[model samples]
Target: ADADPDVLKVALLPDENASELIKRNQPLKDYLEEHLDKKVQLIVTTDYSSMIEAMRFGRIDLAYFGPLSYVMAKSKSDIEPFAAMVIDGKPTYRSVIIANVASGVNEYADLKGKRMAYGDRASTSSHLIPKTVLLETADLTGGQDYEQHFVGTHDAVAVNVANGNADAGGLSEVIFNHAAERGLIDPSKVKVLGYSGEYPQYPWAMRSNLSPELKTKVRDVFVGIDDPEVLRNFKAEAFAPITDADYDVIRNMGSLLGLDF
Candidate 1:
């Protein structure tokens, strides 16, 4: 299957602007090339689903996948989770709902009848967990009590809310903070309304058919990464070992939402 071919390709989720993603991932790409003693290619997809399909079709050797999207991809493809970023000393993250100050959405209950922005539909923190928060906390459902807009990326969701294109939005808290820190979104214009339950951090998965030896090498490079430049791009302190089983909660949540795989 040519799974162990040269020129390893790593696909990064387009959680922000494509150009920015490419620039941010350069450190990771360079580190992989240096450590693996091979050429490394970096790729950015339009959204979470496209990234999953690229992995499924073997268009990429490895990918950074959201918890939910990783579950979907692994269910139909020969990929396995190897590592995830560590935040706050755990391999977990949280989703947040933010509202535009002018929208008068200071709380989750105010989300009803509002325009909401979300990242990819397949994004765990940006869509699933936040959606669950809405359903369980505010009794609001997309397309019924509120308008749903899949803006394609986490930064986009923050931008939408900041620009008043959306009254509120859901996104990974990490991404939202990154956006604010980078000045891509004005913190003064948006305020956090609620936060979802913790979710397993996004996983780094590789084609399972790759040589076992190569897989171990790749995993070591990621897990041993200490370059603050690369870690800054991922907004994590370090990489933590992860297994496919770590994502079962996301799988169960997807099933509860009627999402196939």
Candidate 2:
């Protein structure tokens, strides 16, 4: 068979270690190669911005991206959404507003007149969405109702919250789950004051000009894979089809918040 010029290069964002991601997606690489008969390469980057840069420069063909990065890439690159990791067939997840139990914060209203921690300025669930919801819920204005702290990552916000650096913090479901699962934070030490509504989670996106036949083959191979072990490793049940329209809200939110590269 002739070599397929449409190589499927997958880039994992830099929030975590690259080796961990490779190990987690080995089954996916193997499955895609076997089923699609195309070489699958997994690329890893050191940070979200670098990953976006790679996609912008065509260094990668596809990427797993956070909501903010997904929106940014779609707006800036010729990227097209293909699928999203889903749980129970739902293509969404929520962000939670948590407070350190020792901080004496018991409800959303209690956040008033207190310090809060937010993830990166570009983070959708962990920063933008949660901040919007918290402001509305508490009837407070930014810089007036409370002071804000930009902790680089969701994990850092959670850690600071656990350590009483901030009265409350915002974090995505994945980060919260991983932190709790690893005992990085004592469950009793933190309390979830509220949660934002569901929004599309990480999505798999690729160059828009990719061949139609190649795109179909890629989607089919990914969606049809049903190995239990692989699903477990991905922390998902399956993948669902996605499109630019599906993420319009996220993009609009980012724009409204003035989130820029």
Candidate 3:
């Protein structure tokens, strides 16, 4: 397993539409192939769980993972993160609470007693961080002080808030922006009310079993990426060095939320 595979298989999390993500990631795939001197295959799994399984079984050689998912994957596989996307010149990203412009929810305190939308329970930015924000900042609890709904995806939460179906909702800032750019939601229709404290950004990880020589080459290739199309997909200024310990905050969040993990 120390030898590098002839073809490098890289998996991406299915946080957005899979087909569209694969297409958007083509520039990144091309960049990797050109710089690594190896054929690269980009893959998008249906969900995080499946993507974690693929990595566990060595079906993929490298992967891009959400913070929580990377922690989950590490528990089940011999993988370690080498780098994370640097967003807006930072190594972290924030969960945003967006409210309908006319919903009267202009602040975190205003979220109390309002209908709220969140993505899947496992989502860091969409659910966990946002949930924590309400609890810590607003002194409110979901399903007690406010009505809560799980609409399955970040786009759904944003749409619900934008259309006034929900007074407020939580999602990743990057996803919200992408949704607006894709015309799935109107930026003017919703306003960001608050930002959850920053969490580590998404990580590009390598399986621990890869050859040390190959791993160094792959990490260096990511560090040198400057293609706008590739950076746009990551929503980052650059890829920055990262290590397994950087995700301890996410694990702590999960534990704080009483997640079994």
Candidate 4:
């Protein structure tokens, strides 16, 4: 490897704020360095595309990327998704269609022609799945049947809809629960209209060009992390090995949304 003989590079996606992502992953980083027996270099990538690009160029040895982004990298590059995040002892999570409880928009049908908020355009849970579900169950299209807004983050979408800034919004079930637990949002103000069908969680991918022995060590580091304290920071129950087949739902969503990436 031209980069370094010992140090391992790890990059995290900015699903939340890039600055805060570091704190959320610090415990997992420490555990990896200790177990992998290497000097781990953790970098906070600007966004999902940046994280995927870092891996494609071998700028990073490991990455935590969203499901759709991981699929993008798999289709374009040589990264292997060796581990998946587990929440509540399961390998799946869902997105919620949330509305301000006070808005009198209690049902999916009530959201017709109403304002809706979405996170990043590429977000699997908050954008892709929720949008699809709304189209199917509510008989609505994002820009045609309803007004749409992209607030850029799940918490922002939650707060905006909770405060009645938007008539409805999409949010990750996991993130919404954690935010409420942290007192970041008042759950009473927001009501779930419906949830998307369960989908695979986000993945940890590694550059396939690395040495087999080195890759094994790095893979094992993630596959074995189970400490509740660290998992709490990650909003996950554990990490486990997964294969390409596990991501078919995401691939299907990409097709459904006409997203080439």
| Pairs with steric clashes in candidate 3 | none
For model 2, the run of ten residues with the poorest summed lDDT = 1-10
What is the Cα-based lDDT of residue 119 in candidate 1? 85
For model 3, the stretches where C-alpha displacement exceeds 4 angstroms are 1-3, 102-106, 227-229, 232-235
lDDT of each: 0.85, 0.79, 0.83, 0.80
Per residue, candidate 1 scores C-alpha lDDT tens digits across 1-261 of: 775788888898888788887887788888888899889888888777788888888889988887888888988898888888787788778998899999988888888888999888888888888888889887888889999999888888999999999999999887787787788977899888878877788888999889998998989988998888888766679988888888888888886468765
lDDT of 3 by residue, 76-103 (tens): 8988888877788888888888899988
Per-prediction count of colliding residue pairs? 0, 0, 0, 0
Error of 4 at 40 (Å): 1.9
Candidate 2 Cα errors over 4 Å, as ranges: 1-7, 15-20, 259-261
Q: Report the candidate with higher TM-score, 2 versus 4.
A: 4
Report lDDT (Cα) of residue 112, candidate 1: 82
Clash count, predicted structure 1: 0
In lDDT terms, how accurate is model 2?
0.79
Clashes of 4: 0
lDDT-superior candidate, 3 or 4: 3
- Least accurate 10 contiguous residues by lDDT in model 3: 252-261
Descending-lDDT candidate ranking: 1, 3, 4, 2
Question: What TM-score, over all chains together, does every model reach?
Answer: 0.94, 0.87, 0.87, 0.89
Point to the candidate with the largest lDDT: 1
Which candidate should be chosen as best, given TM-score against the real structure? 1
